Design a protein around this nucleic acid. Sequence first.
DNA 1: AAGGAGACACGGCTTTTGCCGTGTC
Length: 757
Amino acid sequence: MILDTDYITEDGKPVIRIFKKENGEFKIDYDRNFEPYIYALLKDDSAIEDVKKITAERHGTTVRVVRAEKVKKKFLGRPIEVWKLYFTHPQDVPAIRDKIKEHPAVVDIYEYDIPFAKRYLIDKGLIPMEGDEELKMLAFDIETLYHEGEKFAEGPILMISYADEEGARVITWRNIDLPYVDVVSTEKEMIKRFLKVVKEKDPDVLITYNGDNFAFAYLKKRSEKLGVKFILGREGSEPKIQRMGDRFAVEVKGRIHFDLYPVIRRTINLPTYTLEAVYEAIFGQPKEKVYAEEIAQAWETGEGLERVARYSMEDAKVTYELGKEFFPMEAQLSRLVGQSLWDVSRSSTGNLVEWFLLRKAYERNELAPNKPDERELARRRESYAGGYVKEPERGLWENIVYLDFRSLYPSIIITHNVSPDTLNREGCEEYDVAPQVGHKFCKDFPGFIPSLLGDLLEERQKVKKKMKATIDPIEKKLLDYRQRAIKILANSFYGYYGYAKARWYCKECAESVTAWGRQYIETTIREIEEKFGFKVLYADTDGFFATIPGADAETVKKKAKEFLDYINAKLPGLLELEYEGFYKRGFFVTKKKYAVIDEEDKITTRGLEIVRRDWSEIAKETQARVLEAILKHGDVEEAVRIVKEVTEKLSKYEVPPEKLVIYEQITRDLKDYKATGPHVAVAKRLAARGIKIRPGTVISYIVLKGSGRIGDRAIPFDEFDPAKHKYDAEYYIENQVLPAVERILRAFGYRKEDLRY
DNA sequence: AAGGAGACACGGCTTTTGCCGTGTC
Ligand SMILES: [K+]
Ligand SMILES: [K+]
Ligand SMILES: [K+]
């Protein structure tokens, strides 16, 4: 299968490499014949000669238009005639560009920001990740020596761990006595051995967890300190650290660096995103964390290293298992979009739709819109509207089902033929007209985007049936991946339509989909209420929760399924709800916020978690305790007893001052800060006394009883004397603990006043 | 091997029915 593509310059000429793995054998194919190009639109077909002779100079050499060619295409369905301007080297384009545009005879340019290696994938109709191939895969993690305030990677790496189908192992430069540890002499040797293991195992995929930001950069700086040629590429080269806009991404040539963190962070909601959180959420069991200060100990002592190594072998073992769960999904998205898994797994859905469209656009000789310019952008961004809103029921409900709207939207786009090339077309036989908001969609021919969604959904239906004709759970799981990927992809078109940066943006389409949505959602709600006696507890843009007042779990579930058939059969054409889960009890605070608990007792929240940087254990501990009281034991009064008791204990200084410490971190030379928060004012005055304060320093403070700013009365927990000092219990109650729990409990009728003391 | 550019609430300040500067997930 194709794993990746890139190009290399040689003798000034571009060369495409296609990286494959076919029948257990890695190989690199070459293409020297692929010409870069853009599209230009001309006022008159004659001024071509003035253009076919434009030139700009970059990196010494002058750049010409190696060739022009007049070609006929479609732009948004309507025929268009443009000039396809060829070149010599990909890099020519971002330089000759604005000079071709500026020319008075040129109206516009198109398809001038498509990365050459991706341009290749599309035009030759090549598709990464297709075929039977068993890819060979390796997870790895490192565990470093850390002390607060050190420059990045000043500390040495202590261990490198790796795992795959054969098991996990650790490489460390210190004698430890476990059957999966490989002792070597130094860190320089540790690294070199890791490098050898990778070279020998030759994996197609290296799996990290945030390797994009930590591990690879660490290993880089260390390999420079110790003169190790850090070679992981299959063509003998080092990890290529790349800037993606806001963050970094690391590439290993001829392999697939699969960074789990951006995949899991897109996939699931979570307060935290640690390895041990992620592993737990997905697999059930917890992962016994072993902290940095606890690590530096066992190393500098030499005692309890056998613990610290178990942690590293598990980081690797865990990272592998997560990879194996998440890979087959990203692999499906890669096939579907037709781009490398290295790109796809790092993309937003907005961005998958875009690449998908770009490919299909080509398949259909359809010139692509350009991105928004800077003003056309801001114009869109001001014209923003959301989705379906509905007020929630107060109170704590039982046996609740959740039903999913997300699949309605692409069905709507298909059913009412919603797309920019069908929007307000003059002279049609038939129209669909969006409710409330009035946009007309031609119905004579299928539009571009409805056309392709029709194919995706058909494909999904085909897969879903094939799953029913198979008992083998391995093949069933594999098909299930394909089925869910399509759902993910298809369901991204709604947000995409009103996505300001989108090429095929269309406000009218988004509003139109929102209106038809409101209608079908409203119908569904009316149906489940009137005809099935459900009460709808909460409903937003992607689903609603509902129950039968007073019914029991078996009943509600039976009745929910019956409603699914009824409404799925009744709603027009391809429109269908989906049953996305059941919850023991739950409560719903506003348009956007709620908490529910399932039949295994896993609480889930939305818009309720403490999210502030300057939090405190006492705040977090109390909210946690409240939710458990409400959701797990269904006992609102206990939750009120608990909050009261905490506010009491607070004001009578009997809350362990530890629980009041706030950990905030320093990011720059204090000089540089343009404004001074508390933790910065604490630190600032520590520095005025010549104490070591560096980027990376964790300020740990209490707020004390007094007046005015929080900065003026926050002290280092270090300097806190229980005997002498008095904590600001008013702050901890009003600013910290109560805002964490107030919204939850007002929902049940309780006022702030009731929780106070 | 190529260009890209987010959401969200904190404390504090010649905006307690806002605009920064900030730095987390
Ligand atoms: K022009
Ligand atoms: K239907
Ligand atoms: K913090």
